[PDB]
């Protein structure tokens, strides 16, 4: 038999799925969730042997350890140890599409373990083995005898080892295949790996035992009364003296307990379940669970005899919450939700897809601190601990079944095929049985990107029957099919329609109102954060607040999926698709996160945080209107710090206490603000500050902020008197201005400022020229490759138009002396093959105060692709340590991603002005700047800038950030105007009309001085 | 691998289900349904060796033919050959309830065939073998090499033998097991049999082939325009010259044709099915299919090259019809159906469960002739021809999956278990894939008696997704769950509620109007025709006609499930549960048919035909209003014949032609009817004759009748004043009365007419005594057995009150002489344990004419169960060959089943006054009798009688009809009143209260005279 090429066999001898069991033998140990003696980790060192195919496994391996096998830590993905290559493919299957068959050359891992089992474990009761995750299919041996089989990489396979074990030395023999018929249902946009990557353990249950238990919580209309309904089922010998007790605990206070013997209600003509019992517990004024306040009770479930003897105990954390859809709104406890969610793959840069508590808690803290309240389990059920943490910390969860068949043609080839229904069901039904008692799971998901097929319709119904307490969503087949309670598009834009045949992505605003549509809209994927991205994120959040039925979305995605490789010297660098010799691959498309693989925030995470704020503000006069977007809590750990600044100088600060009810408003009347005579722009800045520590945040944590311009006083008073006058020199091929020790040199042949001198010091390493291009971002390249061109992508439009190879051909270069200034006047035309693309006309005005005033006027041809930027660049000579600017900051910000950034006086080390994207691109830009200081230099006016040791030319030629060499001096890019960065998706142009540089005529002015 | 003990493996290497294939290579043969050379039968002589378990089967059998093995016909059930005992069991599984395990002792059939396959079949193309039905699991080998395995007794299993066959002689090894994990899903109330009971055949398709086609016909509002849509799916190498032509044929006229290349519409983001095409055909004023007019078109699918060269062709019969539920009514072509239906089991008395065309046509002819329009495939997909004949002859079909699990406790134990969904789905999806092109299939069913579990829900929605053109029904879990489109109870009564907890059976009239409820109600099982049953069948039909949403039902059931056994003298007898040594068993409960196993009508059938009439009648004065219950057809083959008759003798007749529109009316005025002066009662009698023959009926066929009491003039004139006067001789213990050559012997110690003489010849073998009991019917018995008494049932109520062993005590016996007559007055009091049950007060009166007038006055104790009858019986010494009566007839009729009988003079043999019910009971009764003639004897009055060679005592002591011996003389029971027979169900008291003898006081009068 080739069970791994048979989609109608998914398991052999596998025990039924159930909610997490520990089998405590003490009620107090179960109530506190203390570790159980009856659950035993087998995590640790195992033997591992690699094989190119199952047939190459020697018969001897079932009995004795192979002499050339190494010793490795389980759990692990074996690719992370280097026995073979990890593959990153997005859509295309990493194997040939021939369902159900896999390649004969099928990488085969041979894990083995020697372990002990106490005598007392085998005297009575049942001993089983839990493989929490094995990718992708495996057979199992115990002491050499055959035990069983299992598929689905992301759910606990369980087998009964009772008859197989003997007291003392036992050996496990686990054969793990890389590719299986299970691989066809497992085509997620992630690294393709394999091996025992989750916990292995033993659990001991008595013969008479709890086999399954369901907890439900139903409420009245005001949520003041609740009934906890617990269904318990048993295995073993049924006896009249058997009892079940469910107790509910508020920490240490017991709030309710009930007892009854087995035998349920009459359900049909043949009676009731004799081996089942349902206990109903009344709970008055229950403390409700939500992400805002994760109030939890402990439910203890005991199997005991009538005379008192405990048999075993199970327990779970219980959240009293109601999830329902009514009138088109998705309600948590009778209030409409606003999902501030993110998608999250289980990924670690070292360990691969192996998870741990530290990495899980760090992610959860980072989400909660950045105003997130939900996570999607993209695209598989997670490690069992994950849910316990969302139960305890407070994050809504979409639990998603392990089905993705993206590579199929058409995408629903398998999911409408009834020969594939059994395997699909096993993946939905087993998720539900495992995770159903977790309060944090508010929505089930049928999978990801597998079109729409009858199987989705069938298993949609299955869940609705089995668990009415949760809506079901599925995006496939157009996001609004009959297999979903929620319209859940991906990369659907706010205002723009995308009318693809069969599966259009309508504008989310429009979608809601399509004839006969009633359902809530929550995107399962939006704001593709690949590279420099999240442009237009504000436009999403505005719409969400405005439209009741737009109830938020899940950002794609949380963390970059880059792996760590090492160089000759042994220095670690971040690798992406294709860096392991994996072919075919999809390169940098694995890197879509709001954080780097080490959990360092991308600049995008701050924009997300700012838009997802739970407090909104309005200013009228000098009153501040504060609206709380919480649904349940008061603002009982919140304070408001306000400050007013004149061009960076603080004038008055103050802190007012916040007492805002959920959905409520507070009016803070500010004191008389001081109006200064001084010329400049007044700005108000407010902050919500959490004064006390929480489980997820430090004391003094900032949760929300906002700025308004207050008064502005324009400078009327004249520039300070200068009697010095710059002297013009006119040579055959140079214009040269001179004042004191300051010397400006304009090349009469090229037309640019070719060199500057302060004393006998060179200030420039290249000439100050115009720049209309940028180093392409990931949103600029799209799916384009040098081997398969996508003409629609921005980068290609620019390329073919000759934007990049444009030769500046000078038209005019004259100089004129004024009473107290020298006026240089230049004019250039960047041409490509007879076609004039841009025309720069400048005026340089050096005067007797030392300052060089620059006036640029650019014409852009209407029938050329809009330019990426309109500004100038130069390589300076100085390498200063600090960048000090007045403008929007402190973190990186672009025209379509800058609500987060505040205006003020920012001083940073030079290296913070560069953003280390693994795929190097244009970066570090800061918008809305009125002053930039670098060493002796100072630029004034109104512009955008980035500054670093990296030329655009290098950043566009370098594929990996670790290959980047710091150049001589400092590259400076000053743009009067810079295109948007986009982000709605990353496979088609996503920069919005208002952030394209379409105007045709642009102007800016820059003052260059010394201080 | 114990595959037969695992629900996760239902097949191995089995090809996907599809509609009937033939793989014609000639378009014309395909169109006319001509036999195909590419589809060979493998029926006939096979080798068979029985085994106690699969372990006992030797390895040599895969290679060499076994010597002890016999040569038997295939298809067959090996029980019918006598290899082991057939088992009839109703609810309780024949095996121990321990899913998914079966008894290690597992009857195992070894079928082996050697056969010739021509060389051209192996060169190119695909060669497959089809087992249309193997019960219940089987492994398959070809030439010693293993091919595959299959489950589900009632759906075809197909395997590709291409790589296994050889040029020359090939050998087949089929290991058929009686018990497997599928047996748990096959708990139908029927004889449990095993073996290859359906056609085995070999099919040769090309490599580039049609693999699937779906036909769908949608309509405009008035059905004057239709669109035929044909989805055609291919397998093999896809080339740009491959084309599909689908042509529709009306007999010999091509009404439409369409040609397309492969390449469906885009269905999702990954493109579309390149292996599929949809051809659409317009049809103007199509000929609509129905059970009334089975208009059938013919669709021919041609797979061919672009130049003309045929590759292959398929076809099916296409009926233009639409099934939809609107506003609560099931509409067939926008008109509300009234389902005159029946359940039919595939059962033959000799061949067990092997179906043939002859018997199928006989069933269908018999049904259509008896006013049935619908049939339910209880409880599994039928032989593939059943659908073809139902298509052509015109019967609405409920196609039911092979799923019953009645025996589980509770009933839904497996159907609510997600681990059982895979094996459950297979049975529903493979039924739909096969039968979806049959226009007779109007309703899908999810199974029979298997409670209600999520699996039903999941699969209800699967169907609604795949085939939105058919309602889905399923009775489990209370008959109105979320898994059904139709309220389909079983044995819900018309007025009486049965409020069982959890799954109540409401009175059908009440059910429809329950709060919230909107659906139509079509009973899936009613009028349980077990023996002398179907009392109150008239009540169901009064209801169905009065209530739009009561749209009929399916009688349980068509045929008695008796098998033939031969006794000592080679005589064949009908045998039921127990007679094959089968234990535990459910005795005669296998026989619930309207016809006998050999298709001979029960008297019940005429009642069904009458109540399922398509013509309704009312009579006002002399006007006869005819209403049509057809929806589509006119009455073109219809003629109304009428006849008036005074006391039997016709006075007028003649016939008027019929011309009534569907739902229409026709008034017919009678010519002046000659009023006879002679006393008596006139009776109008109409009949609808079909003058022309049909595919289903012989010319002259009666399809509807009805009677009315016209005028009546009573007897005014006195009897002829006789001159004689009978002599009375009073001795010690005799009252002898003599007149001429006639003598009456009254026993003065018993008070009965002990003897009578027509001269010297004795008349009575046993005296004329009162009778208050009857030989209990199946309905009187219920489930009561002599070991498990059902105290509620009528037979037990009667026994325990002492009805059978009741002793007639004499209270009074006096005689008296009158002016022209003798008068005997006899009072009696039947008693039991100090309690009088009945008191009979009679007067016997013999006068000068020589006629005895008996005048009975019966008081029945209020607190005793109501008697089964209140009459008289005696055993005549005469045996005559004709029974001639004036009353309701000719066939058997009782108080609550007589609407079909007519009032007239009826003359039949004695053997027709007895109904040979396999299980013997009270039988042959005729009601509303005014005159009965037997030999010399004549009886006048208003009574119910039966007449036979068998006593009431004999019938109640005899378990089988073939153990009945004719007693001397003839038994005559004249009842003034008889109880109803019931039949709502056969497991609880079901005699409606108006047909019970609850009056507590009864009177009737009889005239006994010689002629
Ligand atoms: Mg498999
Ligand atoms: Mg994908
Ligand atoms: Mg099986
Ligand atoms: Mg049954
Ligand atoms: Na909203
Ligand atoms: Na990706
Ligand atoms: Na506060
Ligand atoms: Na009706
Ligand atoms: Na039966
Ligand atoms: Na009997």
Swiss-Prot record, chains A, B:
<dbReference type="GO" id="GO:0042802">
    <property type="term" value="F:identical protein binding"/>
</dbReference>
<feature type="binding site">
    <location>
        <position position="987"/>
    </location>
    <ligand>
        <name>substrate</name>
    </ligand>
</feature>
<dbReference type="Pfam" id="PF16353">
    <property type="entry name" value="LacZ_4"/>
</dbReference>
<dbReference type="InterPro" id="IPR023232">
    <property type="entry name" value="Glyco_hydro_2_AS"/>
</dbReference>
<feature type="binding site">
    <location>
        <position position="90"/>
    </location>
    <ligand>
        <name>substrate</name>
    </ligand>
</feature>
<feature type="site" description="Important for ensuring that an appropriate proportion of lactose is converted to allolactose">
    <location>
        <position position="987"/>
    </location>
</feature>
<dbReference type="InterPro" id="IPR011013">
    <property type="entry name" value="Gal_mutarotase_sf_dom"/>
</dbReference>
<dbReference type="InterPro" id="IPR032312">
    <property type="entry name" value="LacZ_4"/>
</dbReference>
<keyword id="KW-0915">Sodium</keyword>
<dbReference type="GO" id="GO:0030246">
    <property type="term" value="F:carbohydrate binding"/>
</dbReference>
<dbReference type="InterPro" id="IPR004199">
    <property type="entry name" value="B-gal_small/dom_5"/>
</dbReference>
<dbReference type="InterPro" id="IPR023933">
    <property type="entry name" value="Glyco_hydro_2_beta_Galsidase"/>
</dbReference>
<keyword id="KW-0460">Magnesium</keyword>
<keyword id="KW-0378">Hydrolase</keyword>
<keyword id="KW-0464">Manganese</keyword>
<keyword id="KW-0326">Glycosidase</keyword>
<dbReference type="Pfam" id="PF02929">
    <property type="entry name" value="Bgal_small_N"/>
</dbReference>
<dbReference type="InterPro" id="IPR013783">
    <property type="entry name" value="Ig-like_fold"/>
</dbReference>
<feature type="site" description="Transition state stabilizer">
    <location>
        <position position="345"/>
    </location>
</feature>
<dbReference type="GO" id="GO:0000287">
    <property type="term" value="F:magnesium ion binding"/>
</dbReference>
<comment type="subunit">
    <text>Homotetramer.</text>
</comment>
<dbReference type="InterPro" id="IPR023230">
    <property type="entry name" value="Glyco_hydro_2_CS"/>
</dbReference>
<dbReference type="InterPro" id="IPR036156">
    <property type="entry name" value="Beta-gal/glucu_dom_sf"/>
</dbReference>
<feature type="binding site">
    <location>
        <begin position="525"/>
        <end position="528"/>
    </location>
    <ligand>
        <name>substrate</name>
    </ligand>
</feature>
<feature type="binding site">
    <location>
        <position position="189"/>
    </location>
    <ligand>
        <name>Na(+)</name>
    </ligand>
</feature>
<feature type="active site" description="Nucleophile">
    <location>
        <position position="525"/>
    </location>
</feature>
<dbReference type="InterPro" id="IPR008979">
    <property type="entry name" value="Galactose-bd-like_sf"/>
</dbReference>
<dbReference type="InterPro" id="IPR050347">
    <property type="entry name" value="Bact_Beta-galactosidase"/>
</dbReference>
<protein>
    <recommendedName>
        <fullName>Beta-galactosidase</fullName>
        <ecNumber>3.2.1.23</ecNumber>
    </recommendedName>
</protein>
<dbReference type="GO" id="GO:0004565">
    <property type="term" value="F:beta-galactosidase activity"/>
</dbReference>
<feature type="binding site">
    <location>
        <position position="189"/>
    </location>
    <ligand>
        <name>substrate</name>
    </ligand>
</feature>
<keyword id="KW-0479">Metal-binding</keyword>
<feature type="active site" description="Proton donor">
    <location>
        <position position="449"/>
    </location>
</feature>
<dbReference type="InterPro" id="IPR006104">
    <property type="entry name" value="Glyco_hydro_2_N"/>
</dbReference>
<dbReference type="GO" id="GO:0031420">
    <property type="term" value="F:alkali metal ion binding"/>
</dbReference>
<feature type="binding site">
    <location>
        <position position="406"/>
    </location>
    <ligand>
        <name>Mg(2+) 1</name>
    </ligand>
</feature>
<feature type="site" description="Transition state stabilizer">
    <location>
        <position position="379"/>
    </location>
</feature>
<feature type="binding site">
    <location>
        <position position="449"/>
    </location>
    <ligand>
        <name>substrate</name>
    </ligand>
</feature>
<feature type="binding site">
    <location>
        <position position="449"/>
    </location>
    <ligand>
        <name>Mg(2+) 1</name>
    </ligand>
</feature>
<dbReference type="Pfam" id="PF02837">
    <property type="entry name" value="Glyco_hydro_2_N"/>
</dbReference>
<feature type="binding site">
    <location>
        <position position="592"/>
    </location>
    <ligand>
        <name>substrate</name>
    </ligand>
</feature>
<dbReference type="InterPro" id="IPR014718">
    <property type="entry name" value="GH-type_carb-bd"/>
</dbReference>
């Amino acid at each position: 038999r080739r069970d791994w090429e048979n989609p109608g066999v998914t398991q052999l001898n596998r025990l039924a799925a159930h909610p997490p069991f520990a089998s405590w033998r003490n009620s107090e140990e179960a109530r506190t969730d203390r570790p159980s003696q009856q659950l035993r980790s087998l995590n640790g060192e195992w033997r591992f042997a690699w094989f190119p195919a199952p047939e190459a496994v020697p018969e001897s391996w079932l009995e004795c350890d192979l002499p050339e096998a190494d010793t490795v830590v389980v759990p692990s993905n074996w690719q992370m140890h280097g026995y073979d290559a990890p593959i990153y493919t997005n859509v295309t299957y990493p194997i040939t599409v021939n369902p159900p068959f896999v390649p004969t050359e099928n990488p085969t891992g041979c894990y083995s373990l020697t372990f002990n089992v106490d005598e007392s474990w085998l005297q009575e009761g049942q001993t089983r083995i839990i493989f929490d995750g094995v990718n992708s299919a495996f057979h199992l041996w115990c002491n050499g005898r055959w035990v069983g089989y299992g598929q689905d990489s992301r759910l606990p396979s369980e087998f009964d080892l009772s008859a197989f074990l003997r007291a003392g030395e036992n050996r496990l023999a686990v054969m793990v295949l890389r590719w299986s018929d299970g691989s066809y249902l497992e085509d997620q946009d992630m690294w393709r790996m394999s091996g025992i990557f989750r916990d292995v353990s033993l659990l001991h249950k008595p013969t008479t035992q709890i086999s399954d238990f369901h907890v439900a919580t139903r409420f009245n209309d005001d949520f003041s009364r609740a009934v906890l309904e617990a269904e318990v089922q048993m295995c073993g010998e049924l006896r009249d003296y058997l009892r079940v007790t469910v107790s509910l605990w508020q920490g240490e206070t017991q709030v309710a307990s009930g007892t009854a013997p087995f035998g349920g209600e009459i359900i049909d003509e043949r009676g009731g379940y004799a081996d089942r019992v349902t206990l109903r517990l009344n709970v008055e004024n229950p403390k409700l669970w939500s992400a805002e306040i994760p109030n939890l009770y402990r439910a203890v479930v005991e199997l005991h005899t009538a005379d008192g003897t405990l048999i075993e105990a199970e327990a779970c954390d219980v959240g009293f919450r109601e999830v329902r859809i009514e009138n088109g709104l998705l309600l948590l406890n009778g209030k409409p939700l606003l999902i501030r969610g993110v998608n999250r793959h289980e990924h670690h840069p070292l360990h691969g897809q192996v998870m741990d508590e530290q990495t899980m808690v760090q992610d959860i803290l980072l989400m909660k601190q950045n105003n997130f309240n939900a996570v999607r389990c993209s695209h598989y059920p997670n490690h069992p601990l994950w849910y316990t943490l969302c139960d305890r910390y407070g994050l809504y969860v979409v639990d998603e079944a392990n089905i993705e068949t993206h590579g199929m043609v058409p995408m629903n080839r398998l999911t409408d095929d009834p020969r594939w229904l059994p395997a699909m069901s096993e993946r939905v039904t087993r998720m539900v049985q495992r995770d159903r008692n977790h309060p944090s799971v508010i929505i089930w998901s049928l999978g990801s990107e597998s079109g729409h097929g009858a199987n989705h319709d069938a298993l949609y119904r299955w869940i609705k029957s089995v668990d009415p307490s949760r809506p079901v969503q599925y995006e496939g087949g157009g996001a609004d099919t009959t297999a979903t309670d929620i319209i859940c598009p991906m990369y659907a834009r706010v205002d723009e329609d995308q009318p693809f045949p069969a599966v259009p992505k309508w504008s989310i605003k429009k979608w809601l109102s399509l004839p006969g549509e009633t359902r809530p809209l929550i995107l399962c994927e939006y704001a593709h954060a690949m590279g420099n991205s999240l442009g237009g994120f504000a436009k999403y959040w505005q719409a969400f607040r405005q439209y009741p039925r737009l109830q938020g979305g899940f950002v794609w995605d949380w963390v970059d999926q880059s792996l760590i490789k090492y160089d000759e010297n042994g220095n670690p660098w971040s690798a992406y698709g294709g860096d392991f010799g994996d072919t075919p691959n999809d390169r940098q498309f694995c890197m879509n996160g709001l954080v780097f693989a080490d959990r360092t925030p991308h600049p995008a995470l701050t924009e997300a945080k700012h838009q997802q704020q739970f407090f909104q503000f309005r200013l009228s006069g000098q009153t501040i209107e504060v609206t709380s977007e919480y649904l349940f809590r008061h603002s009982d750990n919140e304070l408001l710090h306000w400050m007013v600044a004149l061009d960076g100088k603080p004038l008055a600060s103050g802190e007012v206490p916040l007492d805002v009810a959920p959905q409520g408003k507070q009016l803070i009347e500010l004191p008389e603000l001081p109006q200064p005579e001084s010329a400049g722009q007044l700005w108000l800045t407010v902050r919500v500050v959490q004064p006390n520590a929480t489980a997820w945040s430090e004391a003094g944590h900032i949760s929300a902020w906002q700025q308004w311009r207050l008064a502005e006083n324009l400078s009327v008073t004249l520039p300070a008197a200068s009697h010095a006058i710059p002297h013009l020199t006119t040579s055959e091929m140079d214009f040269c201005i001179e004042l004191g020790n300051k010397r400006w040199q304009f090349n009469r042949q090229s037309g640019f400022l070719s060199q500057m001198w302060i004393g006998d010091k060179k200030q420039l390493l290249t000439p100050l020229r115009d720049q209309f291009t940028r180093a392409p971002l990931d949103n600029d390249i799209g799916v384009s490759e040098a081997t398969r061109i996508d003409p629609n992508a921005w980068v290609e439009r620019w390329k073919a138009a000759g934007h990049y190879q444009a030769e500046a051909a000078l038209l005019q270069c004259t100089a004129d002396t004024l009473a107290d200034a020298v006026l240089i006047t230049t004019a250039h035309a960047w041409q490509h093959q007879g076609k004039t693309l841009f025309i720069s006309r400048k005026t340089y005005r050096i005067d007797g105060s030392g300052q060089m005033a620059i006036t640029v006027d650019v014409e852009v041809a209407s029938d050329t692709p809009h330019p990426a930027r309109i500004g100038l660049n130069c390589q300076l000579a100085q390498v200063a340590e600090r960048v000090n600017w007045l403008g929007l900051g402190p973190q990186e910000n672009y025209p379509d991603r800058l609500t987060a950034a505040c205006f003020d006086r920012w001083d940073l080390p030079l290296s913070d002005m560069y953003t280390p994207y693994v795929f190097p691109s244009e970066n570090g830009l800061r918008c809305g700047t009125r002053e930039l200081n670098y060493g002796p230099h100072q630029w004034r006016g109104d512009f955008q800038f980035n500054i670093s040791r990296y030329s655009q030319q290098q950043l566009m030629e370098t594929s990996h950030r670790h290959l980047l060499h710091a150049e001589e001096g400092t590259w400076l890019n000053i743009d009067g105007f810079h295109m948007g960065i986009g982000g709605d998706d990353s496979w088609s142009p996503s920069v919005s009309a208002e952030f394209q540089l379409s105007a045709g005529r642009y102007h800016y002015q820059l003052v260059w001085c010394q201080k």
